[PDB]
Design a protein around this ligand. Structure first.
Ligand SMILES: O=S(=O)(O)OC[C@@H]1O[C@H](O[C@H]2[C@@H](O)[C@@H](CO)O[C@@H](O[C@H]3[C@@H](O)[C@H](O)[C@H](O[C@@H]4[C@@H](O)[C@@H](O)O[C@H](CO)[C@@H]4O)O[C@H]3COS(=O)(=O)O)[C@@H]2O)[C@@H](O)[C@H](O)[C@@H]1O
Ligand SMILES: [Ca+2]
Ligand SMILES: [Cl-]
Ligand SMILES: [Cl-]
Ligand SMILES: [Mg+2]
Length: 257
C-alpha cells in the first residue's frame, strides 16, 4: 500500500522491529508476544497463547470454543471463548506511520488493530465486527472501519473520541489495508487502502509510547467504544474457515533525514 507524502522532503524508512510480512514458519518471538502479557482478555473471552500464530503467509488470530456456552453459569461473563492476541515487544511512538493489511474473521467478535499498555491513552485503528450475531447489525457493522481514542489514568473522566467510515465491501470478505499516521500528539490521520479517510484531534496530547496490538474479543454488552453485537456461535468458533482473522502483514515507518 501507498504511504502519505513525507513531511518536508524527509523520506519514510521502515521501522524493522514493528514490521513483519509474517511469511515464515512461526511467529518472530523477538518482535511479538503470541498472547497478551498485560491483560487476560474481555470476559467471556480470554486470550489463549498460540491462538495467534504465523502460517500460510499471515499472522492468524483464531478464536475457538473453550466450553459450551450452555455449560457455564452465565455466557455473558464466565469464560467460554478462547480469543487471540499478539502484542509488540517494541513500543509504538508518536510520529510513525502504521499500516496492517488484514481480512476480518467471520465471527460475532472483533478483529482489531490498536495501541495500549500505556499510562493514560489508547488508539484503536479498527475494531471490526466481521459477523455480528445480532442480525439487525449485519447491514451496518460488517462495512464499518471505526477508529477511536480512550483516556484513563491521569486523564480518566474523558469520554472516547472516534469516528467511522463505511467500506465498499465487508471486512470479513476482503484483505484491506488500514493505515494510521500518528502525525502529531494532537493529530491522528487514518487511511483506507492508501486514501486518507478520517482524522481525530485527540482530547489531550497523545504523546506517550504504547504497544501495538492485534486481537480478538467477545463484547457481552455495549462498552469501551463498542456496540451490542451479540455473543458468537459455537458452530462458527468450531469452523476454521470462519474463526480466524488473517493479517498478511504489518509495516511501520518513520521519517528520516
Ligand atoms: O487482575 S485484574 O482483574 O486485571 O485487576 C488489576 C487491575 O489492572 C488494571 O488495569 C486493567 C484491568 O481493569 C483489566 C481487567 O480485565 O482490564 C484492563 O483494561 C482492558 C480493558 O478493561 C479496557 O477496556 C481496555 O480494552 C481496550 C478498549 O478500551 C479499546 O482500546 O479497544 C481495545 C481493542 O478492542 C480494548 O478492548 O484496555 C484493556 C487492557 O488493554 S492493554 O493492552 O492496555 O492491556 C485494565 O488495563 C490497573 O489499572 C488496575 O488498577 C488494576 O490492578
Ligand atoms: Ca504475508
Ligand atoms: Cl506462530
Ligand atoms: Cl459467530
Ligand atoms: Mg504462535
Amino acid at each position: 500500500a501507498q504511504l502519505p507524502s513525507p513531511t518536508n522532503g524527509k523520506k519514510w524508512e521502515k521501522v524493522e522491529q514493528l514490521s513483519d510480512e509474517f511469511d515464515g514458519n512461526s511467529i518472530d518471538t523477538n518482535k511479538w508476544y503470541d498472547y497478551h502479557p498485560f491483560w487476560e482478555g474481555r470476559a467471556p473471552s480470554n486470550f489463549k497463547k498460540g491462538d495467534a500464530f504465523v502460517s500460510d503467509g499471515f499472522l492468524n488470530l483464531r478464536s475457538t470454543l473453550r466450553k459450551e456456552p450452555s455449560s457455564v453459569q452465565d455466557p455473558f461473563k464466565d469464560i467460554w471463548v478462547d480469543a487471540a492476541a499478539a502484542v509488540s515487544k517494541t513500543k509504538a511512538q508518536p510520529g510513525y506511520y502504521y499500516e496492517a493489511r488484514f481480512m476480518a474473521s467471520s465471527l460475532s467478535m472483533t478483529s482489531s488493530f490498536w495501541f495500549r499498555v500505556g499510562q493514560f491513552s489508547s488508539i484503536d485503528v479498527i475494531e471490526h465486527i466481521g459477523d455480528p450475531s445480532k442480525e439487525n447489525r449485519q447491514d451496518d457493522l460488517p462495512y464499518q472501519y471505526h477508529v477511536n481514542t480512550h483516556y484513563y489514568g491521569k486523564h480518566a473522566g474523558l469520554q472516547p473520541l472516534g469516528t467511522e467510515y463505511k467500506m465498499p465491501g465487508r471486512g470479513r470478505d476482503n484483505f484491506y489495508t488500514y493505515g494510521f499516521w500518528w502525525k502529531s500528539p494532537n493529530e491522528l490521520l487514518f487511511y483506507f487502502n492508501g486514501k486518507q479517510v478520517m482524522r481525530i484531534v485527540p482530547r489531550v496530547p497523545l504523546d506517550e509510547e504504547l504497544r501495538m496490538i492485534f486481537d480478538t474479543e467477545v463484547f457481552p454488552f455495549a462498552t469501551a467504544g463498542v456496540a451490542n453485537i451479540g455473543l458468537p456461535k459455537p458452530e462458527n468458533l468450531r469452523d476454521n474457515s470462519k474463526n480466524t482473522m488473517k493479517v498478511d502483514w504489518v509495516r511501520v515507518y518513520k521519517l528520516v533525514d
